Design a protein around this nucleic acid. Structure first.
Ligand SMILES: [Mg+2]
Ligand SMILES: [Mg+2]
Ligand SMILES: [Mg+2]
Ligand SMILES: [Mg+2]
Ligand SMILES: [Mg+2]
Ligand SMILES: [Mg+2]
Ligand SMILES: [Mg+2]
Ligand SMILES: [Mg+2]
Ligand SMILES: [Mg+2]
Ligand SMILES: [Mg+2]
Ligand SMILES: [Mg+2]
Ligand SMILES: [Mg+2]
Ligand SMILES: [Mg+2]
Ligand SMILES: [Mg+2]
Ligand SMILES: [Mg+2]
Ligand SMILES: [Mg+2]
Ligand SMILES: [Mg+2]
Ligand SMILES: [Mg+2]
Ligand SMILES: [Mg+2]
Ligand SMILES: [Mg+2]
Ligand SMILES: [Mg+2]
Ligand SMILES: [Mg+2]
Ligand SMILES: [Mg+2]
Ligand SMILES: [Mg+2]
Ligand SMILES: [Mg+2]
Ligand SMILES: [Mg+2]
Ligand SMILES: [Mg+2]
Ligand SMILES: [Mg+2]
Ligand SMILES: [Mg+2]
Ligand SMILES: [Mg+2]
Ligand SMILES: [Mg+2]
Ligand SMILES: [Mg+2]
Ligand SMILES: [Mg+2]
Ligand SMILES: [Mg+2]
Ligand SMILES: [Mg+2]
Ligand SMILES: [Mg+2]
Ligand SMILES: [Mg+2]
Ligand SMILES: [Mg+2]
Ligand SMILES: [Mg+2]
Ligand SMILES: [Mg+2]
Ligand SMILES: [Mg+2]
Ligand SMILES: [Mg+2]
Ligand SMILES: [Mg+2]
Ligand SMILES: [Mg+2]
Ligand SMILES: [Mg+2]
Ligand SMILES: [Mg+2]
Ligand SMILES: [Mg+2]
Ligand SMILES: [Mg+2]
Ligand SMILES: [Mg+2]
Ligand SMILES: [Mg+2]
Ligand SMILES: [Mg+2]
Ligand SMILES: [Mg+2]
Ligand SMILES: [Mg+2]
Ligand SMILES: [Mg+2]
Ligand SMILES: [Mg+2]
Ligand SMILES: [Mg+2]
Ligand SMILES: [Mg+2]
Ligand SMILES: [Mg+2]
Ligand SMILES: [Mg+2]
Ligand SMILES: [Mg+2]
Ligand SMILES: [Mg+2]
Ligand SMILES: [Mg+2]
Ligand SMILES: [Mg+2]
Ligand SMILES: [Mg+2]
Ligand SMILES: [Mg+2]
Ligand SMILES: [Mg+2]
Ligand SMILES: [Mg+2]
Ligand SMILES: [Mg+2]
Ligand SMILES: [Mg+2]
Ligand SMILES: [Mg+2]
Ligand SMILES: [Mg+2]
Ligand SMILES: [Mg+2]
Ligand SMILES: [Mg+2]
Ligand SMILES: [Mg+2]
Ligand SMILES: [Mg+2]
Ligand SMILES: [Mg+2]
Ligand SMILES: [Mg+2]
Ligand SMILES: [Mg+2]
Ligand SMILES: [Mg+2]
Ligand SMILES: [Mg+2]
Ligand SMILES: [Mg+2]
Ligand SMILES: [Mg+2]
Ligand SMILES: [Mg+2]
Ligand SMILES: [Mg+2]
Ligand SMILES: [Mg+2]
Ligand SMILES: [Mg+2]
Ligand SMILES: [Mg+2]
Ligand SMILES: [Mg+2]
Ligand SMILES: [Mg+2]
Ligand SMILES: [Mg+2]
Ligand SMILES: [Mg+2]
Ligand SMILES: [Mg+2]
Ligand SMILES: [Mg+2]
Ligand SMILES: [Mg+2]
Ligand SMILES: [Mg+2]
Ligand SMILES: [Mg+2]
Ligand SMILES: [Mg+2]
Ligand SMILES: [Mg+2]
Ligand SMILES: [Mg+2]
Ligand SMILES: [Mg+2]
Ligand SMILES: [Mg+2]
Ligand SMILES: [Mg+2]
Ligand SMILES: [Mg+2]
Ligand SMILES: [Mg+2]
Ligand SMILES: [Mg+2]
Lengths: 88, 129
RNA sequence: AGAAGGUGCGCCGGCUAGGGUGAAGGAUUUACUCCGUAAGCUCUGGCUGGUCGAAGAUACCAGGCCGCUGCGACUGUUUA
RNA sequence: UUACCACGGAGUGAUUCAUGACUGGGGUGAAGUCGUAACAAGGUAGCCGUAGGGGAACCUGCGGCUGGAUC
RNA sequence: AAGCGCGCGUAGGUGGUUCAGCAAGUUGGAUGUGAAAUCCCCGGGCUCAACCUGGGAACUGCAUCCAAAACUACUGAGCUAGAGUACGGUAGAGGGUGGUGGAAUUUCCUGUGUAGCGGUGAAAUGCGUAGAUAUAGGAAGGAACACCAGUGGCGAAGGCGACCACCUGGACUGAUACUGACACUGAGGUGCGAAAGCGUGGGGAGCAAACAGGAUUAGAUACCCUGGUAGUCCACGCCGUAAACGAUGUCGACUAGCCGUUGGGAUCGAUCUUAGUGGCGCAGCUAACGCGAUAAGUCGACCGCCUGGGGAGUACGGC
RNA sequence: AGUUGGUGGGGUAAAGGCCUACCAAGGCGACGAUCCGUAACUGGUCUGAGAGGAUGAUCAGUCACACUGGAACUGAGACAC
């Protein structure tokens, strides 16, 4: 549901090596933006299970990436959790 | 998901030996290299070569002798799900000594005969006859 | 369901913890103001002894309870 | 005289054995009565789930399968 | 007899590839212990044997020290072959909310017209002179979406075909750049899940369980015919099942070929290469049928399940 | 709920919630606690090619009990066949 401009400004805001789209932080930010964006769509369309499957897949991907990042570096983990405003 | 690369090596060798081929190519590692060398010293293969360039490729040339392949029965023993280890007195015999069983010991990867020669047991990798 | 059933309760001391009101003092908006106050008055508790009687919720006051069934769902109304 | 405490009392639960008027299915029996549901295209192709109906095997509707013959 | 209907995921199990370290697993050695008896071997006694008895071996174990470093575990630093991200395109009945079309059936009204219509194996019930069927015009309403249509496509499965707009998931396809093992499976749990069914409120053309009547029949609570209610449709909630089937769990790697077909790429109608979807077939496998790169072949990782037929997927208990 | 840990004290031949007064809210559990049923354990015995399976008569080691439920005394030693 994201746009080209939205993704570009997200990666610009969260890039860590001036051209890295694969670092955990960028992917986590993109997934969080998409999850937050799809909420209002699912507010109106409660009977759309087929898309909610993809939403759950994105949630699982974000969870796994956060777990890996926490396992690797605690400081970057805490910083990312702080900026994204999510519990854990 | 390749949770056992050595079983993949032996499976490749057996499958392409059954299919009447001449060369088998696979990703290499310092354990498959030792296994290939110990097979070479036992005359079960023709030759083995390791490629350069970061992602080395190991290639093995096979033997046939008669109309039937030289290696007729090769089987992995210690898998990641079992991890079988044996002492010197309990080293298994394949075909009553007519074959060889590869053993990994603190002195390296060698044969069971050399294992008793040095008097050191270890982990039984596979049996070839 | 207060189901059923059980334990304590009087009076006199010892130690001890809290609340309200409220001099003196302090602040500034100098006055029908804010904070805060020792004593006094007043209201809640805790654990420790002693003691009298036959009996300490001592008088008046103040639910008896339980198990099976019929009828009507219930609160209500009716032959002064 | 106090403290601890066995026996023994009172109230109310849990669990587990045996037994119980009367009832529900199951199995095993022999030349019994009624039908003919399946096996062949078994004479309406059979099964699966579900619902209704009927002395009984069962019938009918809805969805599914081929483990269906002719072609 | 035996793969959960299908996913996601927790504890757990397992782990691509380089160095370096450590010594828990692993291996070797030493020491202590492992009661005696018993079992085993070599002997000695009872005239033999049973029996008794000497020495040994064994007691496959546990514990403490010493040494090794291939593999597993642990620690530090790496790498890009697994996994994922960014950028253009392709196809599609993938999902949801609204709107709009044409064919047809039925019902009502009106004109012409008169003696049959309908149905069957043959009939009858039923509809008709209170003017039917047919025929022409108008109106109302509900539902399904011919031709395209394909061994065709998409979806985790169940499943999804009129057209358009809006919201939205995934997959294929090409190059470069990026992260640097972030992976697989998964007891419990969590959701999605045909049809029939249940609750509340709408709607109701066709079809049609139950039901009524007519046939057939020895009977016909059926097959056949004429009608016909729930239901089938919509909104919200529940229910958790199917021969939910490829009767074949998910993931990864290898193994002769030939003929199609759906998307996409390259090189010069031809050749090559991917991701699906079909037909044959060599090895191999199987009790046989048969499977055979979409394995039921050769192998790995994890999970589920089976143990003669009935009783019985039933009883009791829990949810 | 003396339940888990700490402190002071008591007590024992001896460590210890063994006991007591305070302070804290801890301890155990899907590597199966708690609960229900059953049963002394081992050396050994019998079977089996072995791995296993079944099992604790006689002999030897340990434990528990002595009509049923409690309690202590004497004693180096008993909660006393
Ligand atoms: Mg009371
Ligand atoms: Mg008195
Ligand atoms: Mg009472
Ligand atoms: Mg009572
Ligand atoms: Mg009654
Ligand atoms: Mg009566
Ligand atoms: Mg009344
Ligand atoms: Mg009444
Ligand atoms: Mg009544
Ligand atoms: Mg009532
Ligand atoms: Mg009533
Ligand atoms: Mg009243
Ligand atoms: Mg009242
Ligand atoms: Mg009266
Ligand atoms: Mg009572
Ligand atoms: Mg009672
Ligand atoms: Mg009782
Ligand atoms: Mg009873
Ligand atoms: Mg009885
Ligand atoms: Mg009787
Ligand atoms: Mg039938
Ligand atoms: Mg029949
Ligand atoms: Mg039939
Ligand atoms: Mg018939
Ligand atoms: Mg049939
Ligand atoms: Mg059933
Ligand atoms: Mg049926
Ligand atoms: Mg029905
Ligand atoms: Mg029924
Ligand atoms: Mg019927
Ligand atoms: Mg029906
Ligand atoms: Mg059908
Ligand atoms: Mg399954
Ligand atoms: Mg399946
Ligand atoms: Mg499943
Ligand atoms: Mg499960
Ligand atoms: Mg599940
Ligand atoms: Mg089932
Ligand atoms: Mg999973
Ligand atoms: Mg894990
Ligand atoms: Mg590895
Ligand atoms: Mg691990
Ligand atoms: Mg290493
Ligand atoms: Mg050792
Ligand atoms: Mg001994
Ligand atoms: Mg003699
Ligand atoms: Mg060392
Ligand atoms: Mg007409
Ligand atoms: Mg018309
Ligand atoms: Mg399908
Ligand atoms: Mg339905
Ligand atoms: Mg219904
Ligand atoms: Mg309904
Ligand atoms: Mg209704
Ligand atoms: Mg109708
Ligand atoms: Mg009919
Ligand atoms: Mg009809
Ligand atoms: Mg009708
Ligand atoms: Mg009904
Ligand atoms: Mg609906
Ligand atoms: Mg289906
Ligand atoms: Mg099945
Ligand atoms: Mg079967
Ligand atoms: Mg599956
Ligand atoms: Mg598979
Ligand atoms: Mg997956
Ligand atoms: Mg796979
Ligand atoms: Mg694969
Ligand atoms: Mg074939
Ligand atoms: Mg088979
Ligand atoms: Mg077979
Ligand atoms: Mg295995
Ligand atoms: Mg496995
Ligand atoms: Mg496996
Ligand atoms: Mg049985
Ligand atoms: Mg039986
Ligand atoms: Mg049985
Ligand atoms: Mg049941
Ligand atoms: Mg029973
Ligand atoms: Mg039940
Ligand atoms: Mg205390
Ligand atoms: Mg002390
Ligand atoms: Mg103490
Ligand atoms: Mg237990
Ligand atoms: Mg006993
Ligand atoms: Mg045997
Ligand atoms: Mg034995
Ligand atoms: Mg024996
Ligand atoms: Mg025993
Ligand atoms: Mg005895
Ligand atoms: Mg003894
Ligand atoms: Mg002892
Ligand atoms: Mg003893
Ligand atoms: Mg002892
Ligand atoms: Mg004793
Ligand atoms: Mg006695
Ligand atoms: Mg006696
Ligand atoms: Mg006694
Ligand atoms: Mg005494
Ligand atoms: Mg005395
Ligand atoms: Mg004494
Ligand atoms: Mg004693
Ligand atoms: Mg005595
Ligand atoms: Mg005694
Ligand atoms: Mg004694």
């Amino acid at each position: 549901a994201l746009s080209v401009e939205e993704k570009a400004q997200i990666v610009n805001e969260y890039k860590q090596a001036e051209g890295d789209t694969g670092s955990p932080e960028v992917q986590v930010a993109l997934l969080s933006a998409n999850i937050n964006k799809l909420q209002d769509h699912f507010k109106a369309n409660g009977k759309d299970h087929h898309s909610r499957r993809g939403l759950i897949r994105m949630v699982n991907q974000r969870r796994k990436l956060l777990d890996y990042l926490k396992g690797k570096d605690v400081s970057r983990y805490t910083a990312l959790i702080g900026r994204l405003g999510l519990r854990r | 998901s390749m949770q056992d690369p050595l079983a993949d090596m032996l499976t490749r060798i057996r499958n392409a030996q059954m299919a009447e081929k001449t060369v088998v190519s696979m990703p290499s590692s310092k354990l498959k290299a030792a296994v290939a060398k110990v097979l070479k010293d036992e005359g079960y293969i023709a030759d083995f070569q390791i490629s350069s360039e970061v992602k080395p490729q190991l290639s093995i040339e096979l033997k046939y002798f008669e109309g039937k392949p030289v290696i007729e029965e090769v089987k992995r023993i210690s898998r990641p799900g079992l991890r079988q280890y044996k002492s010197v007195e309990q080293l298994p015999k394949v075909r009553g000594g007519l074959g060889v069983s590869i053993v990994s010991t603190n002195k390296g990867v060698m044969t069971d005969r050399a294992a008793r020669a040095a008097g050191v047991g270890g982990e039984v990798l596979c049996t070839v006859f």
